[PDB]
Every structure is written in structure tokens, then in C-alpha cells.
Design a protein around this ligand. Sequence first.
Ligand SMILES: [Cu+2]
Ligand SMILES: [Cu+2]
Ligand SMILES: [Cu+2]
Ligand SMILES: [Cu+2]
Ligand SMILES: [Cu+2]
Ligand SMILES: [Cu+2]
Ligand SMILES: [Cu+2]
Ligand SMILES: [Cu+2]
Ligand SMILES: [Cu+2]
Ligand SMILES: [Cu+2]
Lengths: 266, 266, 267
Amino acid sequence: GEVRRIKLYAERLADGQMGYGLEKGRATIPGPLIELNEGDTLHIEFENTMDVRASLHVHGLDYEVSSDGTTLNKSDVEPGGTRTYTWRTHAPGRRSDGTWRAGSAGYWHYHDHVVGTEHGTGGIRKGLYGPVIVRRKGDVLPDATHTIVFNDMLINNRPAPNFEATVGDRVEFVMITHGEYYHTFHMHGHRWADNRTGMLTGPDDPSQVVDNKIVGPADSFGFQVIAGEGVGAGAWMYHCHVQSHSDMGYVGLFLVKKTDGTIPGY
Amino acid sequence: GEVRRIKLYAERLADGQMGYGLEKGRATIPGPLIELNEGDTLHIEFENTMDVRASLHVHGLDYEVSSDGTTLNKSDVEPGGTRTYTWRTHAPGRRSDGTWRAGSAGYWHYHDHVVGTEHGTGGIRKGLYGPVIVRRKGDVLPDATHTIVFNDMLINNRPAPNFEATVGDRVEFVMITHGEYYHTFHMHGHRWADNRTGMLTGPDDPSQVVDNKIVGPADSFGFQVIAGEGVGAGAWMYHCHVQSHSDMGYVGLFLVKKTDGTIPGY
Amino acid sequence: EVRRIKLYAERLADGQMGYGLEKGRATIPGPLIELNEGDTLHIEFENTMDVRASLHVHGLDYEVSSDGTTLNKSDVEPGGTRTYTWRTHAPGRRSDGTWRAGSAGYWHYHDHVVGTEHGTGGIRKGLYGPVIVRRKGDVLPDATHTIVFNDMLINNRPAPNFEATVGDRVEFVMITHGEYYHTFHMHGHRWADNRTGMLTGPDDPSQVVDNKIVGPADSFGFQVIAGEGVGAGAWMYHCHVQSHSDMGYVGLFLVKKTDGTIPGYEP
Ligand SMILES: [Cu+2]
Ligand SMILES: [Cu+2]
Ligand SMILES: [Cu+2]
Ligand SMILES: [Cu+2]
Ligand SMILES: [Cu+2]
Ligand SMILES: [Cu+2]
Ligand SMILES: [Cu+2]
Ligand SMILES: [Cu+2]
Ligand SMILES: [Cu+2]
Ligand SMILES: [Cu+2]
């Protein structure tokens, strides 16, 4: 386990948005991907560059109330303030009561808990969210990672995103939901296991294999697929499968190229 | 596996409905049950008998973009048109790199993707949906299979269905959700495993045992029960457990008869 | 093995409705019923109210005569009495070579006839409670706390906190009722998405979560080591649906140090 240190900034963005960045003027929505191995400690030197209180709160990871990011625990950040947040992670192991301590590993996320309301409704709506992956020793690592956030009726706060791969690429997706509504995440031409890694461990793994998954606010899951496995290259749509949501125009493509670089035209 | 051929028709029905059928004028809502073993290939000679564009799109199974059933992938069908769709399935197994490839097996479904909207909102509403089961080698086979579809506030597009069995029958249910709303599927007197087959693989399988399940649009799961196991013969209701949904009167019965043919009075 | 309890449905002073083990002792949620796989429980039920009321259970083995429905003539007339029978079974091998799933799990009981023939009125007013069925060898907790998301309410409280000490094995039963989906979230803690809410071992691939989508009549549960790797503190649990959490209904898992103290918080 390594001790890692990063800077993070909350900033107002154009069009009434808010985002996290690794550097001032570089905030994105979603925020930057944070990747740890079980046992790693992360110190986030967080600077609130905004005129409203804001925080950093994380799902899944080990933190003390001093890093809750809540009003309740006085661990949000005043306008223009700085605070060091600490996230820890642990490997699984056998407890002295004979049980198995679940590790930190999994698909997680971070978001604001104080903009607009004491639940971060305003900050989340405006873009203060980002993905976190914690890996277990011997986890299969991907060729690329893509984050898809269903935030209210938006995808990654975009106007009313595409991801490119080549056939055979090991492609990871992080899938985070925020806001008021339930959604169903669907990907054409691909499927995954409903389990920790989104991949079956082997023949003894009875997890359902799905291409559709109901998600609600602050749900996070992830998976890896082999791009075009058994289906070939093409424009592979992903969408919410709630009919009226899918009808609002937000057509995302998983663009899987043949080895020569072509996609069967669309 | 085997190479199978079938014919499928989309037809308009009474009350502005649309159904799939294996023969002209035998369209049903839900559509016909398609059952495959992992490794089997299915060629569907699909005839759109209607006066609007229609398609056939499947979840879970292997298909090329030419069988996507979408306008994006030029694989919908003109009015009066014919198109051969091809569905493939695979068995699980280790890849070259030692990772486990999940099989096709599971509870799946097909539906229209181009009637009313480019997401099949009209076609789905009007009844262009059916079940698909892909079995693994050694899977327990049932005495009967019943399909229950929560389509918006309807069950199988019926106005505001019952299924008969004898005590000890192995009864399979396929549970598909479509449209706008989340639901909770509940069955009295019976329970199942929250996993691929709906049955525990044995004593190592940690899957939750449930009688109630949250489902969203395009969710599919299924399970087998022994009819009346440890509870006896009776009128065993299944219903959505969302209180306003269940109070609308959409409440079917799982009618489990004694071997003599009687049921306790209801 | 064969067990009996008394249960009463009561209109509460405030117009809510609850189950109790004794007259004028009704709670919302109702009393925790705990059974071992194989156990039979006879519930001598008395509806003390001026409206028909029932007892219906998820997950456990019961005949249609204990359905607690109008359809199966097993609701109770005002002032009436009825013995409901709940059976349970261990898992085992059927002759057909298949594995019969046992009764064990996080379950619940609720009214099926107050207001409507689906208990919409009873559930709304507080006629719900938790049932735990344990398998032989299941790990037992220092305490059990029941959290019910009932429409927009938690345990029908006005617009609940649970106290533990660091290292306590604390069990939560999480039931949902009514009209809306929700997402249950607990700060500082996580559990397995499986039967027990606890990973069996390194061979259990179950997702480890701190946030779960739940709909009406869903039940799950889990055990945590209070404050494990995170320390003493006021650990909030809440719905993560943003308009739901903003309504003010937020409970605290108050994890105290062994000297009875807690880091300062501002509720
Ligand atoms: Cu929170
Ligand atoms: Cu959606
Ligand atoms: Cu959160
Ligand atoms: Cu689609
Ligand atoms: Cu419903
Ligand atoms: Cu679909
Ligand atoms: Cu019911
Ligand atoms: Cu301790
Ligand atoms: Cu809620
Ligand atoms: Cu119920």
C-alpha cells in the first residue's frame, strides 16, 4: 500500500455548471478518475474556489468523520477555503470473530454534499461528481476506462458521449447515477456479470449475466467487456431503457472498430 | 449447438395492438417463447405485415450490427418487408489469457426498436415484446413456462393473467418489464434465488433468496419453483407490490391444484 | 422448534397503527420476529381496531389459510382473533437431485386489508415489522436495528438514531414500503449484496456496496463492525434520492468510543 497525494479543486464552469479538476481551470464533468489499490491511502488537498460552501464525500472507501464532507460533521469547505481529505482502503481478511472483512475494492464515486442543500443536490445537479476505482491484487486491468453518469435526465451533464475501441480491446465502464430518477442502463452487443468486477470469476460464479440494470441515485457499478466479442465491430448503442428517457435524444455509441480501423457504416 | 430456422411476423391486432407470432393471425402479447441452448444459432425470417417500419431487437444474445434491429444499423424492416435476423449463443469457457468468458445462458427478451420512436416506444407500448430463454448444458428443465410482462401499468397488455399447475410441478416464470415505470414483482407462497437460473447452485451459493424484486424497463429475470412446495395447493397471487399499482386491480393468480384437481376455496 | 407468540394490531394515540407483543405496546416498525430454519411459529393475532386488519409475511412457508388476504379468507374482523402459522425449512437435496433453497433471510410482515385489499392503508399507517430467519451457523449480532422507508417516511417518524460502540457487530434490516423507489445509503460502512449481507469468503464475488436501490416490499439486511477502519462518529444513513434526502428525514448510526464519547456533530 502506497500513500498518495493529489490536489483537487471545485470551480464554477460555463452554463451554470460546477466541476472538480486536478488543476485550476481544468475542471471536468465527470471529475477526474481516482484509481487506488486496496491498502493505498489518498490525501486530497481540496481547494474550494467557489463563492458557496462545497465538499468532497466518497462512497465505499475508509474515511473518518473529519473527511465525511458533511454539515453534520463540519467537514465541508468555506468559499475559497482549503481542506485535506484522507481516503483509506483495506484488503479483505479474516476477522478474529471468524468472519470475512469485505475489502474496499469496487466501482465507487465522489461528490459534493453541501451545494444547494445539506445533501449536495445543487452541487451534484451542476456537475460535482466523479468516479473512483479501487482494485484488488490480481484484478484484470483494462485497455481503457470510460465513465457514464446518469445525472437526472442528462449523461455526464452533456446537452440533450461516444467511446472508441478496437475489437478485442478489454474495455472498462464505470456507471454512476445521481439526482431524482431511477434509470435502466443498457448496452447493445455486450453483457456483463452482476458482481463486484462485472466479470464472472469462473464456472462456480452464479451471478446473473445482464445487458440491462436498474440504478438509482448514488448507485455505482462497473464492468469490463471484450469489445465486439462474438458480435464484431459496429456502432454499439448504450442508453437508458426507460422509454421517455431514451426518447429525449441522448444517443451514446460504443464505437468498436475492426483491426483495420473501419466501422460497418451507420 | 444446432442451427435453427423460424419465421416471425409482426401484425397489428384489435385495440391498436401489435404482436409477434410464429404464424400469420396467431400473433400473441407477449410474443412466442424462443428457447435455445448455448452454442445454437437461430435464423429468424421476419416479416413486417404492418404499414409502418418495424424491427426485431434482442437482449443478451450474440448478434452482428446487421441484426441490431435499429435505424442506426440499417436493420429495421420497411412496411410489408422481410429480413432474416441471426442470433448466436455461446457456452462459457476460459479465454487464452485465463479470464472466464460468460455464456449466453439466461432469461432474455426481444422487442421492436423503431415503431413510434427510434427506441420502439410505440411498438413496445402496443405489444411488440416476447421472451427468450438460453439454457446451459445440465440446466433443470421445467414442466411449464409462464411469461409475465409489466408493460407500463399493464400485465401482458391485458385490461385492469392466471396460470394453472398441480402441487409438485416444476414451473418456470420469465419476468420482463417495459415502458416508463419501475415495479416490484411479488409472488405469494413461493421464493427464488437472485441469480442466473433463479435456483441456488447448491450450498456454496450465497445469492439472496427473495419473493420480491425491483425491476425497470428492459429488465429480465426468471426462476423455477416447485408449485406449492411446503405451502400446499391454493390461489397464490403474484402482483406488483407498488401500492397504487396493486390497487389498480392488476392481480393474477398462480392456481396450484391438488392432484385430485381441487383448490382451497377462494 | 414449535413456538407461539401473541400479536395485536392497535390504533396508536396519534392515528397510526402498529403491531405489539402486548396490548398498548404496539411499535412502528412492529416487533422483530426471529426464527431458526425448521422452526414453526404460531402467531395468536388479535385485531383490537374497529376496521378489518391482517398479518401477511414474505419469504416464510405458510398455507393459504395464513395468506392474510381477503382472497384466502384470512383477514380478521374488528375485535377479532386468528392464529397465523409460519413454517420454515433448512436447505437440502430434493430426490430430483436439485438444491431446495432454505427459508433463511431478511423478511417482513405487514397488513394486507387496511384501506385496500393490498393493505395500502395499513402499511401507510405503520402495520409492518421485520422477520429474520437464521441458518445454522449464521453469525449473530450485538444488536439489530430495523429501518423502514415507508413512502417518504423512515419508521413513520416525524419530518431514528441507533447507538453502538466501536467494534460492536450491528445488524440492520432494511424494508421498503409504499409508492416510491429509494436508495439506501450508510456513511462510513459497507456490506455485501447477498443473503447475509456478509461475504462468505474470498470466493464470494458478491458486489460490496454502500448504496442500494429498493422498491416497495423489498427487504435485505447486513451486519457491520461498528466504526471498522473509520472510527467513532455520527454516521448518517439516508435515502440518496435528492428530493427525498432534502425533506429532512436523516437518521444517525451513533458509533461511540469505548469511553462513551463521540466526535462532536451538529444535527
Ligand atoms: Cu450522504
Ligand atoms: Cu433514464
Ligand atoms: Cu453520496
Ligand atoms: Cu436499444
Ligand atoms: Cu408496478
Ligand atoms: Cu431493448
Ligand atoms: Cu400480496
Ligand atoms: Cu475495535
Ligand atoms: Cu427515498
Ligand atoms: Cu407484501
